[PDB]
Write an enzyme that holds these catalytic residues in place. Structure first.
Site, PDB file in Angstrom:
ATOM      1  N   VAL A 100      -1.873   4.896 -15.151  1.00 39.83           N
ATOM      2  CA  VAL A 100      -2.039   3.513 -15.603  1.00 39.83           C
ATOM      3  C   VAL A 100      -3.327   2.924 -15.017  1.00 39.83           C
ATOM      4  O   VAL A 100      -3.596   3.074 -13.834  1.00 39.83           O
ATOM      5  CB  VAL A 100      -0.809   2.663 -15.204  1.00 39.83           C
ATOM      6  CG1 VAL A 100      -0.959   1.217 -15.676  1.00 39.83           C
ATOM      7  CG2 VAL A 100       0.446   3.274 -15.790  1.00 39.83           C
ATOM      8  N   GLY A 101      -4.097   2.214 -15.831  1.00 44.21           N
ATOM      9  CA  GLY A 101      -5.359   1.603 -15.370  1.00 44.21           C
ATOM     10  C   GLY A 101      -6.491   2.598 -15.535  1.00 44.21           C
ATOM     11  O   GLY A 101      -7.053   2.696 -16.625  1.00 44.21           O
ATOM     12  N   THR A 108      -2.527  10.779  -7.663  1.00 39.70           N
ATOM     13  CA  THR A 108      -2.894  11.076  -9.051  1.00 39.70           C
ATOM     14  C   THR A 108      -4.284  11.648  -9.025  1.00 39.70           C
ATOM     15  O   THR A 108      -5.200  11.022  -8.459  1.00 39.70           O
ATOM     16  CB  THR A 108      -2.898   9.821  -9.956  1.00 39.70           C
ATOM     17  OG1 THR A 108      -3.586   8.740  -9.328  1.00 39.70           O
ATOM     18  CG2 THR A 108      -1.473   9.374 -10.186  1.00 39.70           C
ATOM     19  N   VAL A 109      -4.446  12.821  -9.626  1.00 41.56           N
ATOM     20  CA  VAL A 109      -5.712  13.538  -9.568  1.00 41.56           C
ATOM     21  C   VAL A 109      -6.149  14.073 -10.919  1.00 41.56           C
ATOM     22  O   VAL A 109      -5.362  14.153 -11.870  1.00 41.56           O
ATOM     23  CB  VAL A 109      -5.664  14.745  -8.598  1.00 41.56           C
ATOM     24  CG1 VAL A 109      -5.348  14.273  -7.207  1.00 41.56           C
ATOM     25  CG2 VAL A 109      -4.664  15.805  -9.037  1.00 41.56           C
ATOM     26  N   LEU A 116      -9.151   8.068  -4.019  1.00 44.40           N
ATOM     27  CA  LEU A 116     -10.158   7.836  -2.978  1.00 44.40           C
ATOM     28  C   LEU A 116      -9.483   7.545  -1.648  1.00 44.40           C
ATOM     29  O   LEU A 116      -9.897   8.076  -0.617  1.00 44.40           O
ATOM     30  CB  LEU A 116     -11.111   6.702  -3.345  1.00 44.40           C
ATOM     31  CG  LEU A 116     -12.232   6.379  -2.333  1.00 44.40           C
ATOM     32  CD1 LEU A 116     -13.121   7.593  -2.039  1.00 44.40           C
ATOM     33  CD2 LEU A 116     -13.077   5.223  -2.869  1.00 44.40           C
ATOM     34  N   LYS A 147      -5.072  13.873 -15.330  1.00 50.34           N
ATOM     35  CA  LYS A 147      -6.247  14.078 -16.173  1.00 50.34           C
ATOM     36  C   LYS A 147      -6.805  15.467 -15.943  1.00 50.34           C
ATOM     37  O   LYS A 147      -6.638  16.057 -14.819  1.00 50.34           O
ATOM     38  CB  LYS A 147      -7.387  13.138 -15.746  1.00 50.34           C
ATOM     39  CG  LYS A 147      -7.181  11.688 -15.998  1.00 50.34           C
ATOM     40  CD  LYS A 147      -8.359  10.915 -15.413  1.00 50.34           C
ATOM     41  CE  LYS A 147      -8.336   9.444 -15.800  1.00 50.34           C
ATOM     42  NZ  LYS A 147      -9.687   9.017 -16.258  1.00 50.34           N
ATOM     43  N   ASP A 191       0.841  -1.168   0.000  1.00 51.67           N
ATOM     44  CA  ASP A 191       0.000   0.000   0.000  1.00 51.67           C
ATOM     45  C   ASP A 191       0.896   1.245   0.000  1.00 51.67           C
ATOM     46  O   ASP A 191       1.568   1.531   0.984  1.00 51.67           O
ATOM     47  CB  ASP A 191      -0.898  -0.031   1.251  1.00 51.67           C
ATOM     48  CG  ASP A 191      -1.867   1.160   1.332  1.00 51.67           C
ATOM     49  OD1 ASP A 191      -1.990   1.966   0.343  1.00 51.67           O
ATOM     50  OD2 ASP A 191      -2.535   1.255   2.400  1.00 51.67           O
ATOM     51  N   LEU A 192       0.831   2.000  -1.092  1.00 52.17           N
ATOM     52  CA  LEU A 192       1.537   3.264  -1.194  1.00 52.17           C
ATOM     53  C   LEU A 192       1.340   4.193   0.005  1.00 52.17           C
ATOM     54  O   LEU A 192       2.285   4.856   0.415  1.00 52.17           O
ATOM     55  CB  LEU A 192       1.175   3.996  -2.484  1.00 52.17           C
ATOM     56  CG  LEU A 192       2.000   5.269  -2.698  1.00 52.17           C
ATOM     57  CD1 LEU A 192       2.380   5.479  -4.152  1.00 52.17           C
ATOM     58  CD2 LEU A 192       1.254   6.502  -2.211  1.00 52.17           C
TER      59      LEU A 192
END
Ligand SMILES: [Cl-]
Length: 152
Positions: A120-121, A22-23, A35, A82, A10-11
Site C-alpha cells: 500500500v502506498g 516489504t521488499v 529503509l 514487487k 512504529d512497526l
C-alpha cells in the site's frame, strides 16, 4: 488464544517475535519501511542484497533472517511485494506471499508477528483489499498473535 490486533506507531518497535518487511527482488531497500529495516539490521540487508544478486529472492517466497537479538524480534521476514522497485505491487503477489508467510510462521513456530500494510502506498494497492487478505491469512494461525499496522 491468538489475537489479530490493530497496530499503531512504529512497526519496528513492535513487541513481537517476528517483524515483516516489504521488499523488492533487486536488492534495494531505499525508501519507506524497508529503509528503516536496512538502518536497524545492516547484516540482514547485506544478506538480502547477496540473495537478490543471486536470484534467490522471488515473489511468493519469504526471505527470512535471524536477528540474533537477546531482546526483541528474533526474525525478520522479508515479504516481496514487487519485482523491480520501478514497478508497482499486485494483489497476486500478496496472495502468493501470504501462502509462504503462513508456512514460515508454522515451520519456525513463531508465536507473534507484526505486519505492515503490504504493497500500500509505495506499491499502489488498496488497503481494504490487503487488510482482508491479511486477516484471512492469520485466521489460519489461531495460536499466533498478529499485529497489523494500517497505512500511516
Ligand atoms: Cl497456529
Amino acid at each position: 488464544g491468538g489475537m489479530i490486533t490493530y497496530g499503531s506507531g512504529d512497526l519496528l518497535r513492535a513487541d513481537t517475535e517476528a517483524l515483516v518487511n516489504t521488499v523488492n527482488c533487486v536488492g534495494v531497500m531505499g525508501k519507506g519501511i524497508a529503509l528503516q529495516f536496512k538502518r536497524r539490521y545492516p547484516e540482514m540487508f547485506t544478506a538480502y542484497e547477496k540473495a537478490c544478486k543471486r536470484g534467490e529472492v522471488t515473489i511468493g517466497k519469504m526471505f527470512v533472517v535471524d536477528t540474533g537479538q537477546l531482546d526483541g524480534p528474533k526474525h525478520i521476514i522479508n515479504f516481496p511485494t514487487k519485482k523491480h522497485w520501478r514497478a508497482p505491487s499486485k494483489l497476486a503477489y500478496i496472495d502468493a506471499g501470504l501462502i509462504d508467510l503462513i508456512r514460515v510462521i508454522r515451520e519456525l513456530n513463531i508465536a507473534s508477528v507484526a505486519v505492515p500494510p503490504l504493497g500500500v502506498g509505495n506499491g499502489g494497492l488498496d488497503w481494504e483489499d490487503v487488510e482482508q487478505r491479511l486477516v484471512s491469512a492469520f485466521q489460519q494461525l489461531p495460536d499466533v498473535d498478529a499485529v497489523i499496522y494500517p497505512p500511516s
